[PDB]
Amino acid sequence: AFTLADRVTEEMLADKAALVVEVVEENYHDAPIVGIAVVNEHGRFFLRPETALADPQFVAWLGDETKKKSMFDSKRAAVALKWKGIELCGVSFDLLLAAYLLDPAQGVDDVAAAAKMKQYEAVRPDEAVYGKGAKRAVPDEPVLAEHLVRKAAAIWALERPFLDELRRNEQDRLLVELEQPLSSILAEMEFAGVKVDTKRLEQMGEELAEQLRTVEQRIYELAGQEFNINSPKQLGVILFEKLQLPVLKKTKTGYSTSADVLEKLAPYHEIVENILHYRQLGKLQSTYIEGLLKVVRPDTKKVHTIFNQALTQTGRLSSTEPNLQNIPIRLEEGRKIRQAFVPSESDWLIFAADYSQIELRVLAHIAEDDNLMEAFRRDLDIHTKTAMDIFQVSEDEVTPNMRRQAKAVNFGIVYGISDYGLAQNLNISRKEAAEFIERYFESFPGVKRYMENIVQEAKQKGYVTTLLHRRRYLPDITSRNFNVRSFAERMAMNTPIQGSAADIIKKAMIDLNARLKEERLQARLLLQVHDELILEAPKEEMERLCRLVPEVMEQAVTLRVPLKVDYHYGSTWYDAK
């Protein structure tokens, strides 16, 4: 039973409650709140949002940090309330983040999935209530209210079992002093958003458009025919049947036309380099020009990404609508779209600070490899130093190609890519790649020991852990299938590395947000991008930030090797280089 309340009453404002502030729009920025459920010691209550969000006692209760609330995905409700001018405080337990720390592979995205983890099933999955895709819709108040009360009652019942397992895993502080405080920082970053110079994007767009139609006209000429260049099937007919170009790699359906195999087909026909150029420009025009323009809010002229904090298996953040963690950087006209991200106020600047080789530094510390640790204590170029060791030469003898290959080995560790993957990246035979790895392990025997020990430890315990006690379970580690076991072994090696880097950057963000308020600076965190923090601040604060931000990031944790931060600022994201 539950009270479908018409008025907010004193008893709904207990100082501990499960709270549900339901936002059904996937993108919760400036999105409607469809209902409110409160469960506490005195009862279970459903509130209409027009009612509750106009009651000064309820609003005051939302914003009172000493009135503790338990929620599922508090950041969604916090941001939706931010857009209504209302602060949400006192969230002492977030069920979504608790479920994510306990087992990231469950894919827990609604209360029901988390509840299943504890054999609690008196709640429906959200897709059963709301529908899927097109037939998505808010149901009637009786149906809506019951579902919201049931989610709140589940949260109420589930806090204690979740906190108990968290404590057993030594993850209670990880939840309470890292992920939940970070969730507030992320909410504030999303709400603030990034200002976008839509005029320059549209200018870049009109320019790729004229360059696309030139190259595209060239392609039809070289094909002797018009076709959908965007359709890898049609393009595959033209390259491999009409032009008789050799088939170097097959895709599950037909012929691969990846930039991979196309570069190897370029000597055979001038159409290929044109297809590659069309691909590059169309990626930018469609995904980055047209994509970003679609999600700039015309009220703010800002993008307000949503950070997904309970998605990745490694503990990294992901971001959506737009995804600002894949904005081009390696090729120039790609990276020039970062010129479209500007400060949101005049006389402000963009400030970007990034960890230099944080994953390899984490590895040096976890593996305690004396050579790796020396390399970083000397602040060497790690790729040059790896090439020196692998190829047994002095620094003066490292050719760019030796460095490129040492860099690919290092990248292969940081991402745990397969031995077959190193051979594929370096376009070498699989055995040539094997003796590469071997040479590396002879130069870094501590990394080899770490590789072998962490795989044994994963087999033994069932999981691997990061510096801050995040864990990833690896059931596939015993599978009698080779490819399935290899990936699980590679995740055993890579997850403590990537996940520890992720932990460090999140602690950096927490420590930085406190120091900014402590220093009374107007600088604000805007974006985190796996290893980079991006802020905007008044011109007048750049100098204090050049000292402050790298200091906070480097001191976030004490490793056996220094942490190194590079930082830049400029009047756009591009120029913070």
Added chain:
DNA sequence: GCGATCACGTA
């Protein structure tokens, strides 16, 4: 409309 598929961008 909705998925499966391919391709590609970042870290």
Added chain:
DNA sequence: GTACGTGATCGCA
């Protein structure tokens, strides 16, 4: 054959 998010095509409704 790493972590993910997005756009296009395409075949089946």
